[PDB]
Amino acid sequence: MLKKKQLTVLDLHPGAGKTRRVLPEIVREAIKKRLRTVILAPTRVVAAEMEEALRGLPVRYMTTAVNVTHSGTEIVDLMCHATFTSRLLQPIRVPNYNLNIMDEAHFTDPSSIAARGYISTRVEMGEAAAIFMTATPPGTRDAFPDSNSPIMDTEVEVPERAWSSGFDWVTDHSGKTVWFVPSVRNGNEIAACLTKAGKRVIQLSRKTFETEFQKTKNQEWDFVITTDISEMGANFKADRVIDSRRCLKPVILDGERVILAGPMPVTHASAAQRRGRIGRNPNKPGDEYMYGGGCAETDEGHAHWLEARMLLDNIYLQDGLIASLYRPEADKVAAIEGEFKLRTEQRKTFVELMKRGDLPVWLAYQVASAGITYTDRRWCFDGTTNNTIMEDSVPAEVWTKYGEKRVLKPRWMDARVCSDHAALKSFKEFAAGKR
Ligand SMILES: O=C(CC(F)(F)F)N1CCNCC1
Numbered sequence: 162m163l164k165k166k167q168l169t170v171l172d173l174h175p176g177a178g179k180t181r182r183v184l185p186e187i188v189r190e191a192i193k194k195r196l197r198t199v200i201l202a203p204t205r206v207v208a209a210e211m212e213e214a215l216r217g218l219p220v221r222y223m224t225t226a227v228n229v230t231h232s233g234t235e236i237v238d239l240m241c242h243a244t245f246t247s248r249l250l251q252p253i254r255v256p257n258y259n260l261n262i263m264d265e266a267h268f269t270d271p272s273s274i275a276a277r278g279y280i281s282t283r284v285e286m287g288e289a290a291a292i293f294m295t296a297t298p299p300g301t302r303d304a305f306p307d308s309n310s311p312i313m314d315t316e317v318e319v320p321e322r323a324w325s326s327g328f329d330w331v332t333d334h335s336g337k338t339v340w341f342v343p344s345v346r347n348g349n350e351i352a353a354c355l356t357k358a359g360k361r362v363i364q365l366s367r368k369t370f371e372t373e374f375q376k377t378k379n380q381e382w383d384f385v386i387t388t389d390i391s392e393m394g395a396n397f398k399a400d401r402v403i404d405s406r407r408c409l410k411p412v413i414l415d416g417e418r419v420i421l422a423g424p425m426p427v428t429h430a431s432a433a434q435r436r437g438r439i440g441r442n443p444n445k446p447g448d449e450y451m452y453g454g455g456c457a458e459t460d461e462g463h464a465h466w467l468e469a470r471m472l473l474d475n476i477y478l479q480d481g482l483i484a485s486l487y488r489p490e491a492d493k494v495a496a497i498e499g500e501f502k503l504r505t506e507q508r509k510t511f512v513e514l515m516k517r518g519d520l521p522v523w524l525a526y527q528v529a530s531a532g533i534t535y536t537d538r539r540w541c542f543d544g545t546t547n548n549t550i551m552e553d554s555v556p557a558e559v560w561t562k563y564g565e566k567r568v569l570k571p572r573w574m575d576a577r578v579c580s581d582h583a584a585l586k587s588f589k590e591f592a593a594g595k596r
Contacts, residue, residue, distance in 0.1 A: 162187070163187075163191060163194060163196060163290050165287060165288065165289060166284060166287045166290070167290050167291075168281055168284045168290070168291045168292075169292050169293070170266075170295070171183060171295075172297075174307040174437075175308065175441070176309045176440070179294045180210065180211065180264055180294070180394070184200070184214060184262070185214055185215055188215060188218055188220070191237065192237060195236065196236070196259040196260040197236050197257075197258050198237045198258060198262065199238050199245065199260075199262065200220070200238070201241065201242045201261070201262065202224075202240070202264055202265075203242055203273065203393040204370060204371070204394070204395075205224060205226035206226075206370065206394075206395065207265060207394045208222070208224045208239065208240075208241060209227055210394075210396075211239060211264070212229065212239075215239075218237070219232060219235045220235055220237045220238075221238045222239050223239065223244060224239070224244070242268060242272055242273040243273075245276050246273075246275045246276050246476075249275075257288065257289070258289060259289055259290065260289070260292070261280040261284075261289060261292070262291070263276065263277065264394065265295060265394045266295040267295040267296075267297045267298065267299070267392070269465055271465045271522050272469075272472065274465060274466060274468075274469035274486065275469045275472040275476070277486070277487040278469060278485060278487055279473065279476060281485075281488065283484075285485075296433065296437065297430035298430075299430070299487070299489040299490040301430050301433065302429050304429045304436070305436065306437070308439075308441065309440060309441050309442060309443045310440050310444070310445060310446040311440065312436065312447075312448050313450070314450050315452070317451045318453060319403055319405050319451060319452070319454075320351065321342075321347060321453075322350055323350055323351070323354035332355075332360070334401060336401055337385075337397070338384045338385070338399060338400075338402070339385045339397050339403075339438050339439070340384055340386050340403040340404075340405075341387055341388070341392075341402070341405060341435045342386055342387070342405055343388075343409055344424070344580065345366045345388060345580070345581040346581055347424070348364050348386040348388065349364070355384055360384055361381065361382045361383045361384070362382065362386055363376045363384070363386070364387070365385060365387040365388070365391055366387070366581075368583055368584075374395065385397060385399070392435060395438070396438070396441070397438055397439075400439065400447075400448045400449065401439065401448065402435060402439050402448075402451070404427075404435045404436065404451065404452045405453050406426060406452050406455065406456065407423065407454060408427045408431065408459065409423045409424060409580075410423050410459050410463050411464035411465065411521075411576070412462065412463070413464050413467060418573065419464055419524070419574070419577065425457070425459050426454055426456055426457035426459055427459065428460055429456045431456075432456050436452075460490075461493055462493070462494070464523060466486070466493040466496075467494045468521070468522035468523055469494075470494060470501060471501040471522055471523070471526045473485075474499055474500065474503075475508050475511065475512075483499050485498060501526060507530060507532065510528070510534060510535050511525050511529035511530075518596065519587060519596075520591070524577075524578065527573040531572075538561070538562065538591070538592055538593075538594055540573070541570075541572075541592035542561070542568070544570045545570070548571055548572070549568060549569070549570045550569040550570070550574075550585065550588075551579075552579075556568045557579075559592050561593060571592075
């Protein structure tokens with residue numbers, strides 16, 4: 162497994178022990194062979210669980226999610242998938258790791274796809290080994306994989322709005338339920354309906370994940386309402402999963418705007434990971450999985466794969482060479498390697514718009530490639546009338562850094578900057594020059 166030119170997919174079923182049992186064994190062997198090694202966690206929550214499974218082993222934790230006093234003699238580094246890709250893009254030298262281990266390797270965020278592309282290219286080149294740990298590798302067609310204990314799978318209509326009748330089975334349950342919804346806004350409506358019925362609800366999404374996930378351990382709850390982020394190794398002490406089987410798909414239209422299409426079917430990999438939250442305890446058979454739609458290959462033409470290509474085109478590999486996407490996920494985007502390669506100054510602006518600006522990859526690229534500098538926010542106000550961002554059914558407004566009240570009307574419209582109240586609040590701060 163650990164020899165150069167080898168990429169291994171460790172595809173044991175969800176809950177088979179890849180992280181707590183296999184990962185420590187791989188790490189001890191890597192340390193024995195003096196292999197400079199990187200371990201990639203999808204989230205800060207998974208990073209903290211990894212420190213528990215690897216306690217006593219000399220591992221350098223490159224995350225503030227763990228409070229450890231490093232010895233300085235570690236040859237194994239652990240960081241998030243996003244941190245690995247970010248450090249590659251920044252001028253900082255990243256060691257050329259002999260062994261690259263990615264946990265929850267199915268993660269489809271642009272930075273995780275870019276990390277797989279870079280690592281798999283180094284393996285193809287004969288320069289490194291890699292291990293991708295996931296029950297659901299790219300292109301998997303099985304939404305019902307094995308589990309630690311039998312699961313009751315039931316196809317049923319699942320509410321996507323508040324309801325007054327017709328879904329008694331949802332509230333009649335006396336255990337704990339994890340409910341996957343297509344968006345933060347959809348979860349808000351379902352959570353309000355459940356709270357009005359006397360239920361204790363926790364809501365999870367990308368921006369609130371670490372903070373809110375702690376509540377699943379610190380307090381008694383009846384329902385967790387979550388977006389697709391809980392497919393990335395989040396573990397719950399639950400006996401039921403309710404799965405809408407739906408998600409939002411970012412789509413670039415005519416190369417000039419990004420919309421959030423759908424809700425539409427999830428992939429088989431996503432469905433298998435949502436279901437995989439339960440059936441994990443061999444002593445508790447009969448956990449339930451209620452699903453409300455079919456699966457489809459909705460990663461085809463999904464913006465994240467084009468965004469992954471924008472990131473990889475701006476990462477140095479060797480001379481003018483550019484890393485390809487990991488082969489099983491390379492047909493998801495029709496893109497020419499190198500088409501998004503930016504010159505030195507525009508590349509620095511592109512990195513800063515993502516790192517400090519917190520903009521989506523696609524939007525950061527449109528701004529940097531137009532020759533606009535990081536602090537120049539005139540583009541947030543000079544788009545066409547159809548690009549007006551709305552808040553409470555009225556045009557959103559901000560005070561510019563000049564002290565003028567203007568309507569938010571970006572030159573390039575990316576639906577992700579206003580997908581929920583939290584995102585639009587962050588984008589207003591950016592348009593005003595506050596970061
Ligand atoms: O809340 C935000 C920041 C905003 F773009 F809106 F400024 N997000 C999360 C990161 N991706 C873009 C959307």
